[PDB]
Design a protein around this nucleic acid. Structure first.
Lengths: 88, 22, 96, 210, 99, 135, 198
RNA sequence: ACCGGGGGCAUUCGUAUCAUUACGCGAGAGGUGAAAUUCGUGGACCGUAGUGAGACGCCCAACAGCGAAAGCAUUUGCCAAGAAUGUCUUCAUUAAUCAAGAACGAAAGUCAGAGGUUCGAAGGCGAUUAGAUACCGCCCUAGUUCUGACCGUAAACGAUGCCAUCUCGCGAUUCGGAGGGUGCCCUGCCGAGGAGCAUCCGGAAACGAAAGUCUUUCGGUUCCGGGGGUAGUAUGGUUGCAAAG
RNA sequence: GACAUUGUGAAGAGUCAGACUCU
């Protein structure tokens, strides 16, 4: 059964630090504790080791990514720009 | 700009009523 | 592109195939692998090994336009396939 | 009198134009570290092809940039070309589709020129229908054809030859005669041409040009 | 009461039409609704064409023209008399008036 | 003072005539446009601000400029008509025609006349509100 | 003490039988087993270390060399980067944009790593607890907790003292103030909330 | 050689606005009904050539097109989707409308991060006025722009729900097709749109080829109204960070 | 700010009568 209506993972903080701060922390906590699909082996086994470091449980590759997300929008855009310049 | 201002007046009154009831 | 998916579906429905690296290597060694389809995210060393085996066996290698997830989906499986070998095209024109 | 310090120089257009005398400019006479020649080098003058070649195509304008000064002569070279606002406004008509194109094309000398071309749909001889529109796919094809024709015409030659071709606007008529296979085009002109990238000044080539 | 069958605009088969800024007042008016006029005039007034011609530096010089597409909102157009109020019957007349 | 005339050659300056609805500039430069021979504005000739753009002010400025040009040896003028442009009115003000005719009457030869009002491919938002100037 | 991960990279010594290991802040996307090419002829790829003169305008770089040979000094915090604004071949120089918005001119031979620094977005999660800040500064240095000057006595701070907790004097102090007086907004050009761009 | 400002993501170009650099000028410039606030000899405004930022895509542009609506317009590349038309292709009733339920949904507004050119609520001045917390002018803050989330309201209008069918004439218009002639023309040519003026009947009328085929009422179906206010208010419920729905 | 450390060349202006001063 759904134990918490809206607080979710941030329920560890109880009634502290303010609703807005807890809401802002919820997104990043979920992102940093989620599993991501590894671009190398293709399996959803990428997990955060430390801030910026992501380990693949299967292929054992260590990637430098975001603090709380596997990849960042700015990094994606930079990669796209480099690829486009390579193509043309 | 005649009934729209009545709406604005009523909204102000409702805001005051909310503040008072709170 | 869109044609290879249809040919692969026809091969799965009617043809004969082996899904996976080890079976692909065995089929290449014993010379019944008509074609070898290989995903785009396969490890580079494995890619080179498959290509070397194919060059030895005089068989075609097709670099699928997708990762192992998409290759498995094309094969119609709910798991990931990073390599496969078609040994009998069946009622399909995959080889040509 | 503040005008007692000014010396008068004569602008000299390059040899693509018949009338090599453009006009008279002026500048403060050399004083201290300010040299009149160095002050003049870099100026831009707008002239009309009516004043350069005396052809009927008066509406076309040429910008000439001063790169060297000998004596009292300011030798200029092509810097940019543009049509006249009155001509463009007269050209634009209602009930006609306007096709605009622009392309960066490289000369054999080291220049990159951005050429802007404008064209309009033409009414046939025996046409009753008021409007002269066409399918947007046909517009796309016509634009691509114009770009390709510009590339073929310019690429392979150098700045002198391109300026010679612009003087009568041979490219415009070539477009009007080739691209009409899809929809008969009318009133095609090279609306503008500007210099994106240019090579380092070559005084020997400029002298040959003068 | 509905004054006009077209509701004062020229909008059919369309949901939204981008607006223009009136040449005089600057007010925003839908392009279909705003009254447009294309004015082509001699660059020099009729009273000075002769003076400019006699002062011309060329044997034969064609005097250019000014082309202006003016958009007026309804209020400024009526005030400047670009358009006038019409009778109930004459309102339906759509042919441009004689020039 | 001035250039050397080859016994009847037309020495050409360029007169920029910026005729707005608040003032009128007649500004003479060389062909390059980077050197100014002389310039006069209607506000220099009239006292009240309401008539800085009047045809009388425009013609007075044009007469003064023609006198100075004839003094310096310039005898022909390439005209460059201009309005406020940009997001503002595209129509030349009421001083443009007066200045042009005044130059012609003063006796400068008139070369090529062109309108150089700045026209945008598209503009920033205009000055007034969405309801315009209500006065 | 650093918010950006470090990359241990192994190179072969050209002059002897030995391998040399290098420590540098990783660019986002760099992974173990990757090959990083460093030099004037290296291509435009993420993680490569190349002179800034060979990059096109708008290229995103990190670990930029302030002076040729200083081994990377600019844009080293997590998620930060500089941009290649312009070039000047005649003087052999390049204009770049720093993370702070400043524009700086460097020699075209200055090296930089292509890409942005890994670990971006760190300063978006609130440090909800004071213990989090305690642990944060425990790994960096002794700069926390911070006691307000007005809460002190006049013997330890220019703001201290008074029957009310108030500064009493303008907080904006001049640049050349003495060591014990330079507290507050130092050489402040302006104060208050910034309304507009700046 | 389909059609389309339908959608999304990158990308190219364009002048203009502002700022600023270089050079010249010389005292006004700006703005108004008239002025003033304001800018200007530290040389403004005006010229010519650059540079930078952000915004916006003029003219073409239309009783033109596309989209469920809101809405949609610089070039090119890529992605998925679609209408009409053609069809002696396939399935064979699979359909219409829909409580509850769900997606989208202008502008303003809220939250976070970037940007901050222009314009500009609030604010401050100069005017006008009996006053002017306004209209007019000047300087501007939020905002206007992008990214990711909220709100779910507009005269969100055709003030006309959707599906099917019948009733008139004319000539134009967008798309596709058929047949002829030389991209254009012709066929009282065929469908699908979007309209216009000859219009039976209808309507209190204005007017409507639908708002007609209704006391000769009755094709199917959803929502809504019951003299004007109190009042979209109070209270209760529910959604929302708030504003509020 | 001045003097010393402080050397070697160009261009401009100003002082002089080949020098000095500045930029």
């Amino acid at each position: 059964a759904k134990r918490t209506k809206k607080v979710g993972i941030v329920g560890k903080y109880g009634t502290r630090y303010g609703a807005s701060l807890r809401k802002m922390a919820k997104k990043l906590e979920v992102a940093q504790h989620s599993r991501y699909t590894c671009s190398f082996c293709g399996k959803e086994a990428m997990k955060r080791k430390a801030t910026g470091i992501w380990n693949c449980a299967k292929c054992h590759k260590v990637v430098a990514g975001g603090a709380y997300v596997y990849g960042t929008v700015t990094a994606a855009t930079v990669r796209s720009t480099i690829r486009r310049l390579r193509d043309l | 700009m005649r009934e729209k201002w009545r709406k604005k007046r009523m909204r102000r009154l409702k805001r005051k009523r909310r503040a008072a009831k709170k | 592109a869109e044609n290879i998916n249809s040919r692969l579906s026809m091969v799965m429905k009617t043809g004969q195939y082996v899904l996976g690296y080890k079976q692909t290597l065995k089929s290449l060694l014993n010379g019944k692998a008509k074609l070898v389809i290989i995903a785009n995210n396969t490890p580079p060393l494995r890619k080179s090994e498959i290509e070397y085996y194919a060059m030895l066996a005089k068989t075609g290698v097709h670099h699928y336009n997708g990762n192992n997830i998409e290759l498995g989906t094309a094969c119609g499986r709910l798991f990931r396939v990073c390599t496969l070998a078609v040994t009998d095209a069946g009622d399909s024109d995959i080889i040509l | 009198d503040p005008f007692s310090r000014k010396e008068w120089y004569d602008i000299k257009a390059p040899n693509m134009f018949n009338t090599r005398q453009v006009g008279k400019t002026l500048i403060n006479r050399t004083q201290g570290t300010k040299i009149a020649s160095e002050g003049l080098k870099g100026r831009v003058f707008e002239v009309s092809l009516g004043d350069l070649n005396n052809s009927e195509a008066d509406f076309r304008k040429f910008k000439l940039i001063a790169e060297d000064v000998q004596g009292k002569n300011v030798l200029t070279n092509f810097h940019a070309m543009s049509m006249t606002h009155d001509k463009l406004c007269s050209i634009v008509k209602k009930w006609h589709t306007l096709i605009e194109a622009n392309t960066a094309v490289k000369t054999t000398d080291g220049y990159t020129l951005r050429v802007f071309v404008i064209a309009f749909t033409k009414k046939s001889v025996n046409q009753v229908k008021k409007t002269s529109y066409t399918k947007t796919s046909k517009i796309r094809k016509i634009r691509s054809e114009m770009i390709g024709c510009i590339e073929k015409e310019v690429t392979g030659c150098d700045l002198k030859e391109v300026v010679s071709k612009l003087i009568p606007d041979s490219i415009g008529k070539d477009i009007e005669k080739t691209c009409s296979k899809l929809y008969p085009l009318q009133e095609v002109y090279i609306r503008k041409v500007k210099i994106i990238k240019r090579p380092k000044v070559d005084l020997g080539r400029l002298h040959d040009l003068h | 009461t509905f004054k006009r069958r077209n509701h004062g605009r020229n909008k059919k088969n369309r949901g939204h039409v981008a607006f223009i800024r009136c040449t005089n007042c600057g007010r925003c008016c839908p392009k279909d609704k705003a009254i447009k006029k294309f004015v082509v005039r001699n660059i020099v007034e009729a009273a000075a064409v002769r003076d400019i011609g006699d002062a011309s530096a060329y044997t034969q010089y064609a005097l250019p023209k000014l082309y202006h597409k003016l958009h007026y909102c309804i209020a400024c157009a009526i005030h400047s008399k670009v358009v006038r109020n019409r009778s109930r019957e004459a309102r339906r007349d759509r042919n441009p008036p004689p020039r | 003072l001035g250039p050397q005339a080859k016994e009847g050659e037309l020495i050409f300056g360029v007169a920029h005539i910026f005729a707005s609805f608040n003032d009128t500039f007649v500004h003479i430069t060389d062909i390059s446009g980077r050197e100014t021979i002389v310039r006069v504005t209607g506000g220099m000739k009239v006292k009240a601000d309401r008539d800085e753009s009047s045809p009388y002010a425009a013609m007075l400025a044009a007469q003064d400029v023609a006198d100075r040009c004839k003094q310096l040896g310039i005898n022909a003028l390439h005209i460059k008509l201009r309005a406020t442009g940009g997001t503002r009115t595209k129509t030349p003000g009421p001083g443009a025609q007066s200045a042009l005719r005044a130059l012609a009457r003063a006796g400068m030869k008139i070369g090529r006349i062109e309108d150089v009002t700045p026209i945008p491919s598209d503009c920033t938002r205009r000055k007034g509100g969405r309801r315009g100037r209500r006065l | 003490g650093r918010g950006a991960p470090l990359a241990i990279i192994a190179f072969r010594d050209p002059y002897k039988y030995k391998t040399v290991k290098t420590t540098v802040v990783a660019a986002e996307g760099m992974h173990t087993g990757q090959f990083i090419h460093c030099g004037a002829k290296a291509q435009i790829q993420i993680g490569n270390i190349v002179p800034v003169g060979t990059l096109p305008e708008g290229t995103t770089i990190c670990n930029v060399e302030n002076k040729s040979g200083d081994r990377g000094v600019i844009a080293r915090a997590s998620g930060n980067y500089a941009t290649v604004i312009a070039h000047n071949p005649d003087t052999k120089k390049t204009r770049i944009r720093l993370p702070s918005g400043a524009k700086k001119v460097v020699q075209s031979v200055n090296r930089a790593m292509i890409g942005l620094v890994a670990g971006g977005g760190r300063t978006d999660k609130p440090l909800l607890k004071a213990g989090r800040s305690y642990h944060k500064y425990k790994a960096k240095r002794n700069s926390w907790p911070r006691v307000r000057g007005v809460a002190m006595n006049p013997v330890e701070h220019p703001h201290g003292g008074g029957n009310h907790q108030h500064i009493g004097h303008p907080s904006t102090v001049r640049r050349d103030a003495s060591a014990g007086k330079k507290v507050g907004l130092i050489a402040a050009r302006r104060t208050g909330r910034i309304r507009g761009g700046k």
